[PDB]
Amino acid sequence: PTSSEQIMKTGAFLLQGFIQDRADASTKKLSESLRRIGDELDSNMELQRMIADVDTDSPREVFFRVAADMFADGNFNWGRVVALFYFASKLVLKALPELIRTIMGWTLDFLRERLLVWIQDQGGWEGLLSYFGTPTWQTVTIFVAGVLTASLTIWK
């Protein structure tokens, strides 16, 4: 649950499950709530414009500095993790097989290197269900879009 092994395994499934959309009961609830936020984010034309306004050449550079920017204050919140996974899945489209593995690899690297301890401090990925368990949880979209927009600006 809070073990790093499980957190990486679960993160891998949630990301794989996520990317396969743009292309037990508690974890299904996460998959589906991420999906819904993804669907709404995909309707934000300002956000999709910015994600198109970024050089797909050298994906490793843009992925990692975007991810580092969202987390440059040394703090954590689930909206930033949602933004990261969403941006990774958009990079898969912006360049497309092995691309999927590579970007998942970069993302998994960032999670292990930077997010692991925070997610442990949340009780694991169960924390993300807490983040989703509110009234009007769908307005979390506005927040995740904001986090993504600020991070593409510096790049842009």
From Swiss-Prot:
TM spans, by residue?
139-156
Gene3D superfamilies the UniProt entry points to: Blc2-like
Q: Name one GO molecular function term.
A: protein homodimerization activity
The short sequence motif called BH2 sits at 117-132
Q: Where is this motif: BH3?
A: 30-44
Looking up Pfam families in the UniProt record yields: Bcl-2 (PF00452)
What does the PTM comment of the record read? Ubiquitinated in the absence of XRCC6/Ku70.
Q: How does it assemble?
A: Homodimer. Forms higher oligomers under stress conditions. Forms heterooligomers with BAK. Interacts with BCL2L11. Interaction with BCL2L11 promotes BAX oligomerization and association with mitochondrial membranes, with subsequent release of cytochrome c. Forms heterodimers with BCL2. Forms heterodimers with BCL2L1 isoform Bcl-X(L), BCL2L2, MCL1 and A1. Interacts with SH3GLB1. Interacts with SFN and YWHAZ; the interaction occurs in the cytoplasm. Under stress conditions, JNK-mediated phosphorylation of SFN and YWHAZ, releases BAX to mitochondria. (Microbial infection) Interacts with gamma-herpesvirus 68 protein vBCL2.
Q: Which InterPro entries match?
A: Bcl-2-like_sf, Bcl-2_BH1-3, Bcl-2_fam, Bcl2-like, Bcl2_BH1_motif_CS, Bcl2_BH2_motif_CS, Bcl2_BH3_motif_CS
Keyword Coiled coil listed? The answer is no
**Which keywords has UniProt assigned to this entry?**
Acetylation, Apoptosis, Cytoplasm, Host-virus interaction, Isopeptide bond, Membrane, Mitochondrion, Mitochondrion outer membrane, Nucleus, Transmembrane, Transmembrane helix, Ubl conjugation
Q: Which GO terms describe its cellular component?
A: BAK complex; BAX complex; Bcl-2 family protein complex; cell periphery; cytoplasm; cytosol; endoplasmic reticulum; endoplasmic reticulum membrane
* Motif BH1, chain ranges: 69-89
- PROSITE patterns listed in its UniProt record: BCL2_FAMILY, BH1, BH2, BH3
One GO BP annotation is:
nervous system development
What does the function comment of this entry state?
Answer: Accelerates programmed cell death by binding to, and antagonizing the apoptosis repressor BCL2 or its adenovirus homolog E1B 19k protein. Under stress conditions, undergoes a conformation change that causes translocation to the mitochondrion membrane, leading to the release of cytochrome c that then triggers apoptosis. Promotes activation of CASP3, and thereby apoptosis. BAX deficiency leads to lymphoid hyperplasia and male sterility, because of the cessation of sperm production.
Q: What is known of its domains?
A: Intact BH3 motif is required by BIK, BID, BAK, BAD and BAX for their pro-apoptotic activity and for their interaction with anti-apoptotic members of the Bcl-2 family.
Could you identify this protein by its name?
Answer: Apoptosis regulator BAX
Q: Which organism is it from?
A: Mus musculus
Spell out the family assignment given in the record's similarity comment. Belongs to the Bcl-2 family.
Which tissue types show expression of this protein?
Expressed in a wide variety of tissues.
Name the CDD domains for this protein.
Bcl-2_like (cd06845)
- At the top level, the lineage of the source is Eukaryota
| Annotated SUPFAM superfamilies | Bcl-2 inhibitors of programmed cell death
